[PDB]
Coordinates of C-alpha atoms in Angstrom, one line a residue:
Chain A
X2 CA 0.1 10.0 14.1
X3 CA 0.1 9.1 10.4
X4 CA 0.4 5.9 8.4
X5 CA 2.9 4.7 5.9
Chain B
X13 CA 28.5 -28.7 -1.0
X14 CA 25.6 -26.3 -2.1
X15 CA 23.7 -23.5 -0.2
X16 CA 20.2 -22.4 -1.2
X17 CA 20.2 -19.1 -3.0
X18 CA 17.6 -17.7 -0.7
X19 CA 19.5 -18.6 2.5
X20 CA 20.7 -16.2 5.2
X21 CA 18.2 -13.3 4.6
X22 CA 16.6 -11.6 7.4
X23 CA 13.6 -9.2 6.8
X24 CA 12.6 -7.0 9.8
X25 CA 9.2 -5.4 8.8
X26 CA 7.7 -2.7 10.8
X27 CA 4.3 -4.4 10.6
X28 CA 2.6 -7.6 9.7
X29 CA 1.2 -8.3 6.1
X30 CA -2.0 -6.4 5.3
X31 CA -1.6 -3.7 7.9
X32 CA -0.5 -0.1 8.2
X33 CA 2.6 1.1 9.9
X34 CA 2.7 4.1 12.3
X35 CA 4.7 7.3 11.9
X36 CA 4.8 10.3 14.3
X37 CA 5.8 13.4 12.3
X38 CA 7.4 14.8 15.5
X39 CA 9.2 11.7 16.8
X40 CA 9.7 9.4 13.7
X41 CA 8.0 6.0 13.1
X42 CA 7.3 3.7 16.0
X43 CA 9.4 0.7 14.6
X44 CA 12.4 3.0 14.1
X45 CA 12.2 4.6 17.6
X46 CA 12.0 1.1 19.1
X47 CA 14.7 -0.4 16.9
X48 CA 17.2 2.4 17.7
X49 CA 16.4 2.5 21.3
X50 CA 17.1 -1.2 21.8
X51 CA 20.1 -1.3 19.5
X52 CA 21.8 1.6 21.4
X53 CA 21.4 -0.4 24.7
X54 CA 22.0 -3.9 23.4
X55 CA 23.2 -3.9 19.9
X56 CA 26.6 -5.2 21.1
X57 CA 25.6 -7.9 23.5
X58 CA 22.2 -9.5 22.2
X59 CA 21.6 -11.9 19.3
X60 CA 19.7 -10.4 16.4
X61 CA 16.4 -12.2 17.2
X62 CA 16.6 -11.3 20.8
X63 CA 16.9 -7.8 19.7
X64 CA 14.1 -7.9 17.3
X65 CA 11.8 -9.7 19.7
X66 CA 12.4 -6.8 22.2
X67 CA 11.6 -4.5 19.4
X68 CA 8.3 -6.3 18.8
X69 CA 7.5 -6.1 22.4
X70 CA 8.2 -2.4 22.8
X71 CA 6.3 -1.3 19.7
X72 CA 3.4 -3.6 20.9
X73 CA 3.3 -2.1 24.4
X74 CA 4.7 1.4 24.3
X75 CA 2.7 2.8 21.5
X76 CA -0.8 3.6 20.7
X77 CA -2.0 5.9 18.0
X78 CA -3.6 9.4 18.6
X79 CA -5.7 11.0 15.8
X80 CA -8.4 13.6 15.4
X81 CA -9.9 11.1 12.9
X82 CA -11.5 8.5 15.1
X83 CA -11.0 5.9 12.4
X84 CA -7.2 6.2 13.0
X85 CA -7.5 6.8 16.9
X86 CA -6.1 4.4 19.6
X87 CA -4.7 1.8 17.0
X88 CA -1.9 -0.6 17.8
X89 CA 1.0 -2.2 15.9
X90 CA 3.1 -5.4 15.8
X91 CA 6.3 -5.8 13.7
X92 CA 7.1 -8.8 11.8
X93 CA 10.5 -10.6 11.6
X94 CA 11.1 -13.1 8.8
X95 CA 14.3 -15.1 9.2
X96 CA 16.1 -17.3 6.7
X97 CA 19.2 -17.1 8.8
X98 CA 21.2 -20.3 9.4
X99 CA 23.1 -19.1 12.4
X100 CA 23.0 -16.8 15.3
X101 CA 24.0 -13.2 14.7
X102 CA 26.0 -11.1 17.0
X103 CA 27.4 -7.7 15.9
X104 CA 30.6 -8.0 18.0
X105 CA 33.9 -10.0 18.2
Chain C
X57 CA 29.9 -23.3 15.0
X58 CA 26.5 -21.9 15.8
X59 CA 27.3 -18.2 15.2
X60 CA 28.0 -16.4 12.0
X61 CA 31.8 -15.7 11.6
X62 CA 32.4 -12.1 12.4
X63 CA 36.1 -12.0 12.0
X64 CA 36.4 -9.7 9.0
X65 CA 38.2 -6.4 8.4
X66 CA 34.9 -4.7 8.4
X67 CA 31.3 -5.3 9.7
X68 CA 29.9 -4.2 6.4
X69 CA 27.9 -1.8 4.3
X70 CA 24.5 -0.2 5.5
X71 CA 22.5 1.4 2.9
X72 CA 19.7 3.6 4.1
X73 CA 17.0 4.8 1.6
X74 CA 15.0 7.7 2.9
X75 CA 12.0 8.5 0.9
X76 CA 10.2 11.7 2.2
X77 CA 8.9 13.2 -1.1
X78 CA 6.8 11.7 -3.7
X79 CA 5.4 12.6 -7.1
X80 CA 1.8 13.7 -6.7
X81 CA 0.5 11.2 -9.3
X82 CA 1.4 8.4 -7.0
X83 CA -1.2 9.6 -4.5
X84 CA 1.3 9.6 -1.6
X85 CA 1.8 12.4 0.8
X86 CA 5.1 13.7 2.4
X87 CA 6.4 11.4 5.1
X88 CA 7.0 13.9 7.9
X89 CA 9.2 12.5 10.7
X90 CA 11.2 10.3 8.2
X91 CA 14.3 12.5 8.5
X92 CA 14.6 12.0 12.2
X93 CA 14.3 8.2 11.5
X94 CA 17.2 8.4 9.1
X95 CA 19.3 10.4 11.4
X96 CA 18.8 8.0 14.3
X97 CA 19.2 5.0 12.2
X98 CA 22.5 6.4 10.7
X99 CA 24.0 7.2 14.2
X100 CA 23.0 3.9 15.4
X101 CA 24.4 1.7 12.7
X102 CA 27.6 3.7 12.4
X103 CA 28.0 3.1 16.1
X104 CA 27.5 -0.6 15.4
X105 CA 30.4 -0.5 12.9
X106 CA 28.7 -0.3 9.6
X107 CA 29.8 1.9 6.6
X108 CA 26.6 3.9 6.4
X109 CA 25.4 5.5 3.2
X110 CA 22.1 7.5 3.1
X111 CA 20.0 8.0 -0.1
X112 CA 17.1 10.4 -0.3
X113 CA 13.8 10.7 -2.3
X114 CA 14.8 7.7 -4.7
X115 CA 12.9 6.8 -7.7
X116 CA 12.1 3.1 -8.3
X117 CA 14.9 2.8 -10.9
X118 CA 17.4 4.5 -8.6
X119 CA 16.5 2.1 -5.9
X120 CA 16.9 -1.0 -8.1
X121 CA 20.2 0.2 -9.6
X122 CA 21.8 1.3 -6.2
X123 CA 21.1 -2.1 -4.8
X124 CA 22.3 -3.9 -7.9
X125 CA 25.6 -2.1 -7.9
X126 CA 26.0 -2.7 -4.1
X127 CA 25.5 -6.4 -4.9
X128 CA 28.2 -6.2 -7.4
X129 CA 30.8 -4.6 -5.1
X130 CA 33.4 -6.8 -3.3
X131 CA 32.2 -7.9 0.1
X132 CA 34.9 -10.5 0.7
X133 CA 36.2 -8.5 3.8
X134 CA 32.8 -7.8 5.2
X135 CA 30.8 -9.8 7.8
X136 CA 27.3 -8.9 6.5
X137 CA 25.1 -6.4 4.8
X138 CA 22.3 -4.2 5.9
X139 CA 19.7 -2.2 4.0
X140 CA 17.1 -0.1 5.7
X141 CA 14.0 1.1 3.6
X142 CA 11.9 4.0 4.7
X143 CA 9.0 4.7 2.6
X144 CA 5.4 4.3 1.5
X145 CA 4.3 0.7 0.8
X146 CA 1.6 -1.8 0.1
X147 CA 1.6 -5.6 0.5
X148 CA 4.9 -7.1 -1.1
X149 CA 5.7 -3.7 -2.5
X150 CA 7.6 -0.5 -1.8
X151 CA 7.3 3.1 -3.2
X152 CA 9.8 5.1 -5.0
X153 CA 9.0 8.6 -5.5
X154 CA 7.4 7.8 -8.8
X155 CA 5.7 4.4 -8.2
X156 CA 6.0 0.9 -6.6
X157 CA 8.6 -1.8 -7.1
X158 CA 8.4 -5.3 -5.5
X159 CA 10.4 -5.9 -2.3
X160 CA 11.4 -9.3 -3.9
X161 CA 13.2 -7.6 -6.7
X162 CA 15.1 -5.3 -4.4
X163 CA 16.5 -8.1 -2.3
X164 CA 16.9 -10.7 -5.1
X165 CA 20.1 -8.8 -6.1
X166 CA 21.8 -10.2 -3.0
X167 CA 20.8 -13.9 -3.7
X168 CA 23.7 -16.5 -3.1
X169 CA 24.1 -16.9 -6.9
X170 CA 24.0 -13.2 -7.7
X171 CA 26.2 -11.9 -5.0
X172 CA 28.9 -14.6 -4.3
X173 CA 30.8 -12.5 -2.0
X174 CA 27.9 -12.4 0.6
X175 CA 27.4 -16.0 0.3
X176 CA 27.0 -17.6 3.8
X177 CA 26.8 -14.1 5.2
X178 CA 23.7 -12.5 6.8
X179 CA 21.8 -10.1 4.5
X180 CA 19.6 -7.8 6.6
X181 CA 16.7 -5.7 5.6
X182 CA 14.8 -3.4 7.9
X183 CA 11.7 -2.0 6.3
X184 CA 9.6 0.8 7.6
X185 CA 6.5 0.9 5.3
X186 CA 2.7 0.1 5.2
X187 CA 1.9 -3.4 4.0
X188 CA -1.9 -2.7 3.5
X189 CA -4.6 -0.6 5.0
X190 CA -5.8 -2.7 8.0
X191 CA -5.8 -1.2 11.4
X192 CA -5.2 -3.2 14.6
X193 CA -7.7 -2.0 17.2
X194 CA -6.0 -3.9 19.9
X195 CA -7.5 -5.6 22.9
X196 CA -7.6 -5.5 26.8
Chain D
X13 CA -3.4 -1.0 28.3
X14 CA -3.7 -2.7 24.9
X15 CA -2.0 -5.4 23.0
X16 CA -2.1 -5.8 19.3
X17 CA -4.5 -8.6 18.1
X18 CA -1.9 -9.9 15.7
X19 CA 0.8 -10.0 18.5
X20 CA 2.4 -13.2 19.8
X21 CA 2.1 -15.5 16.7
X22 CA 5.0 -17.6 15.2
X23 CA 4.8 -19.1 11.7
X24 CA 7.5 -21.8 11.0
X25 CA 7.2 -22.4 7.3
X26 CA 9.0 -25.2 5.7
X27 CA 10.0 -23.1 2.7
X28 CA 10.1 -19.4 1.5
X29 CA 7.3 -17.7 -0.3
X30 CA 7.0 -18.7 -4.1
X31 CA 8.9 -21.9 -3.6
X32 CA 8.4 -25.6 -3.5
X33 CA 9.0 -27.9 -0.4
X34 CA 10.6 -31.2 -0.7
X35 CA 9.3 -34.4 0.7
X36 CA 10.9 -37.8 0.7
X37 CA 8.4 -40.6 0.4
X38 CA 10.6 -43.0 2.3
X39 CA 11.7 -40.8 4.9
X40 CA 9.3 -37.9 5.1
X41 CA 9.7 -34.1 4.3
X42 CA 13.0 -32.4 4.8
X43 CA 11.6 -29.7 7.2
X44 CA 9.9 -32.2 9.5
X45 CA 12.9 -34.5 9.7
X46 CA 15.1 -31.5 10.6
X47 CA 12.6 -30.1 13.0
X48 CA 12.2 -33.3 14.9
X49 CA 16.0 -34.0 15.0
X50 CA 16.6 -30.6 16.7
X51 CA 13.6 -30.9 19.0
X52 CA 14.8 -34.3 19.9
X53 CA 18.1 -33.0 20.9
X54 CA 17.4 -29.5 22.1
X55 CA 13.7 -29.0 22.5
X56 CA 14.0 -28.4 26.3
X57 CA 17.2 -26.2 26.5
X58 CA 17.2 -23.9 23.5
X59 CA 15.1 -20.8 22.8
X60 CA 12.7 -21.5 19.9
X61 CA 14.5 -19.1 17.4
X62 CA 17.6 -20.9 18.3
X63 CA 15.9 -24.0 17.5
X64 CA 14.4 -23.0 14.2
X65 CA 17.6 -21.2 13.1
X66 CA 19.3 -24.6 13.6
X67 CA 16.5 -26.2 11.6
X68 CA 17.2 -23.6 8.8
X69 CA 20.7 -24.6 8.7
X70 CA 20.1 -28.5 8.6
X71 CA 17.6 -28.1 5.9
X72 CA 19.9 -25.9 3.9
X73 CA 23.0 -28.0 4.4
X74 CA 22.0 -31.7 4.9
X75 CA 19.5 -32.0 2.0
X76 CA 19.7 -32.0 -1.8
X77 CA 17.0 -33.5 -4.0
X78 CA 17.3 -36.6 -6.2
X79 CA 14.9 -36.9 -9.0
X80 CA 15.0 -38.9 -12.4
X81 CA 13.4 -35.7 -13.7
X82 CA 16.4 -33.5 -14.2
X83 CA 14.1 -30.4 -13.7
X84 CA 13.7 -31.4 -10.1
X85 CA 17.3 -32.8 -9.6
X86 CA 19.8 -31.4 -7.2
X87 CA 17.6 -28.7 -5.8
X88 CA 17.9 -27.1 -2.4
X89 CA 15.6 -25.7 0.3
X90 CA 15.6 -23.0 3.0
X91 CA 12.8 -22.7 5.5
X92 CA 11.2 -19.4 6.6
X93 CA 10.4 -18.3 10.2
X94 CA 7.9 -15.6 10.7
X95 CA 7.9 -14.3 14.2
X96 CA 5.5 -11.8 15.8
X97 CA 6.6 -13.1 19.4
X98 CA 7.1 -10.5 22.0
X99 CA 9.1 -12.6 24.4
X100 CA 11.7 -15.4 24.3
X101 CA 10.2 -19.0 24.3
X102 CA 11.5 -21.9 26.1
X103 CA 9.5 -25.3 26.5
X104 CA 10.6 -26.0 30.1
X105 CA 10.2 -24.6 33.6
Chain E
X58 CA 12.0 -11.2 28.8
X59 CA 10.6 -14.8 28.5
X60 CA 7.1 -16.0 28.1
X61 CA 5.8 -17.3 31.5
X62 CA 5.5 -21.1 31.1
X63 CA 4.5 -21.7 34.7
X64 CA 1.0 -23.1 34.0
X65 CA -0.6 -26.5 34.6
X66 CA -0.1 -27.4 30.9
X67 CA 2.1 -26.7 28.1
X68 CA -1.0 -26.6 25.8
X69 CA -2.9 -28.1 22.9
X70 CA -1.2 -29.2 19.7
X71 CA -3.2 -29.9 16.7
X72 CA -1.6 -31.9 13.9
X73 CA -3.5 -32.0 10.5
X74 CA -2.0 -34.7 8.3
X75 CA -3.5 -34.6 4.9
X76 CA -2.3 -37.6 2.8
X77 CA -5.1 -38.4 0.3
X78 CA -7.0 -35.9 -2.0
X79 CA -10.1 -35.9 -3.9
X80 CA -9.6 -36.7 -7.6
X81 CA -11.2 -33.4 -8.5
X82 CA -8.4 -31.4 -6.8
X83 CA -5.8 -32.8 -9.1
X84 CA -3.3 -33.4 -6.2
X85 CA -1.4 -36.6 -5.7
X86 CA -0.8 -38.8 -2.6
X87 CA 1.6 -37.3 -0.1
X88 CA 3.7 -40.5 0.7
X89 CA 5.9 -40.0 3.6
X90 CA 3.6 -37.7 5.4
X91 CA 2.6 -40.4 8.0
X92 CA 6.1 -40.8 9.0
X93 CA 6.2 -36.9 9.5
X94 CA 3.0 -36.9 11.6
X95 CA 4.2 -39.9 13.8
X96 CA 7.6 -38.2 14.4
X97 CA 5.9 -34.9 15.2
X98 CA 3.4 -36.5 17.5
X99 CA 6.4 -38.0 19.6
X100 CA 8.3 -34.8 19.6
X101 CA 5.6 -32.5 20.6
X102 CA 4.2 -35.1 23.1
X103 CA 7.6 -35.2 24.7
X104 CA 7.7 -31.4 25.0
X105 CA 4.4 -31.6 26.8
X106 CA 1.8 -30.9 24.2
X107 CA -1.5 -32.6 24.2
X108 CA -1.3 -33.9 20.7
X109 CA -4.1 -35.1 18.5
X110 CA -3.7 -36.1 14.8
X111 CA -6.6 -35.6 12.3
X112 CA -6.1 -37.3 8.9
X113 CA -7.3 -36.4 5.5
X114 CA -9.3 -33.3 6.6
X115 CA -11.7 -31.4 4.2
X116 CA -11.3 -27.6 4.2
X117 CA -14.4 -27.2 6.3
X118 CA -13.0 -29.7 8.8
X119 CA -9.7 -27.9 9.2
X120 CA -11.7 -24.5 9.7
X121 CA -14.0 -26.0 12.3
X122 CA -11.1 -27.8 14.0
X123 CA -9.2 -24.6 14.6
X124 CA -12.3 -22.5 15.4
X125 CA -13.4 -24.9 18.1
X126 CA -9.7 -25.1 19.4
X127 CA -9.8 -21.3 19.7
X128 CA -13.0 -21.4 21.5
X129 CA -11.9 -23.7 24.3
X130 CA -10.5 -22.3 27.7
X131 CA -6.7 -22.0 27.5
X132 CA -6.5 -20.3 30.9
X133 CA -4.4 -23.1 32.4
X134 CA -2.1 -23.5 29.3
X135 CA 1.1 -21.8 28.4
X136 CA 0.7 -21.8 24.6
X137 CA -1.0 -23.4 21.6
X138 CA 0.5 -25.2 18.7
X139 CA -0.8 -26.4 15.3
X140 CA 1.0 -28.3 12.6
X141 CA -0.3 -28.4 9.1
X142 CA 1.0 -31.1 6.6
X143 CA -0.3 -30.8 3.2
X144 CA -0.1 -29.6 -0.6
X145 CA -0.3 -25.8 -0.7
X146 CA 0.3 -22.7 -2.7
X147 CA 1.2 -19.2 -1.4
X148 CA -1.1 -18.2 1.4
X149 CA -3.2 -21.3 0.9
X150 CA -3.3 -24.9 2.1
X151 CA -5.1 -27.9 0.6
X152 CA -7.8 -29.8 2.3
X153 CA -9.0 -33.1 0.9
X154 CA -11.5 -31.2 -1.3
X155 CA -9.8 -27.9 -2.3
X156 CA -7.7 -25.0 -0.9
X157 CA -8.4 -22.7 2.1
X158 CA -6.5 -19.6 3.1
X159 CA -4.0 -20.0 5.9
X160 CA -4.9 -16.7 7.2
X161 CA -8.5 -17.8 8.0
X162 CA -7.2 -20.8 9.9
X163 CA -5.0 -18.7 12.2
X164 CA -7.2 -15.6 12.6
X165 CA -9.3 -17.6 15.1
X166 CA -6.5 -17.2 17.5
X167 CA -6.2 -13.4 17.4
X168 CA -6.0 -11.7 20.7
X169 CA -9.6 -10.3 20.4
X170 CA -10.9 -13.7 19.3
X171 CA -9.2 -16.0 21.9
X172 CA -9.0 -14.2 25.2
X173 CA -7.4 -17.1 27.1
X174 CA -4.4 -17.2 24.7
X175 CA -3.8 -13.4 25.0
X176 CA -0.2 -12.7 25.6
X177 CA 0.6 -16.3 24.9
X178 CA 2.5 -17.8 22.1
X179 CA 0.6 -19.3 19.3
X180 CA 2.6 -21.5 17.1
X181 CA 2.0 -22.7 13.5
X182 CA 4.2 -25.1 11.7
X183 CA 3.5 -25.5 8.0
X184 CA 4.9 -28.2 5.7
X185 CA 3.5 -27.2 2.3
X186 CA 4.5 -25.7 -1.1
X187 CA 4.3 -22.0 -1.4
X188 CA 4.7 -21.8 -5.1
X189 CA 6.4 -23.4 -8.0
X190 CA 10.0 -22.0 -7.9
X191 CA 13.0 -24.2 -7.4
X192 CA 16.2 -23.3 -5.6
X193 CA 19.0 -24.5 -7.8
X194 CA 21.6 -23.7 -5.0
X195 CA 25.2 -22.5 -5.4
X196 CA 28.8 -23.4 -5.0
Chain F
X2 CA 11.8 -36.8 -3.9
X3 CA 8.6 -35.1 -4.7
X4 CA 7.2 -31.6 -4.0
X5 CA 4.3 -30.3 -1.9

């Protein structure tokens, strides 16, 4: 998962 | 007579002020998955706040982050609805 | 008399801004997964009755201009307006490919006094973006 | 498993960010007057977002400022609801 | 789809009614606020809240009030409510003696800091300015 | 009519  | 110029906006943010927002490169962002899923099933029969509240619930319960970086591992997210609406909103009839 | 009047020729416009790629000077990386969001949002909002338009990899100027012109169109025969923003962000602010622009300025175009044909009509903004760097560890 | 630590808050602000909030010295603030009227009539049978939405409407429509200072004359106000709730909220049963 | 409200109590309701301010803060008297607090006390009492009104609170008092409230046992309550009546600016509210961030007041009730309100609604009602802009209205 |  990545963050914005 | 007059109406406030800021009336009748609604802001459906994916997350709360100060916080990050999660996006899965393979499945899309959490908020969007949840939003579309609930809109597909209830977009035509539930009021907009009922919809977004259900979106809040689904993002809050169904998702938890996975990262190889432990700093970003097992994190949670809650979206944030800001309503200046003056009536209930249904997308039908 | 407690619900927005939905008896219009059309439900209304839905603008999607899908920002995947960013100038490296912004520090921002590619937003992998965003195309799948834009596809799902588009199918979903078209199905609701919105006239959907999708914009990609927009500069800050493009975003401001696009929404301004949308606010200057005639919405007399629409029930509402919807805009969906997919991007990088920080608190109160959203990324174009080339920098940040305030959320306040993007939405101000549709104020009651600057968009008279959306007066007393719902103006919806859905925003997928970070609002800072904090992480929620959860509990229980 | 887990629940976000920011989940299940609701902030009912009298006004939107950046703006003033009106108070009548003889009858009290606009938001509180509106809130109490709607709670008085519907506190037990409406969901809280329905309640606050109606409050938004009453503040937006029923009030307009009077001041001898023209800078503060004939101004309007819209409240601002921020929901991180994950369920619907009724005050009875 | 609804919060479970089947508890012995609706819950605690704190009202902070700030009318008078130290001369050093520059802020004037908030005439009309007593009428607000009394009207709120009746409405929220009628809903079932255990309401207590604190008047002219310093910033420290407000902080302590909410911290102590978050440290009580809410196991048999359905929810919590707090109502703030004061001067304010964006993200901040006036005590008698200065300003304090709203975030710090509410943070006490985070899920990891108030386990007995976990999965329960935590309500905050705020009558206060959030800046200096005026809405001229239209039509 | 006063502001807060």
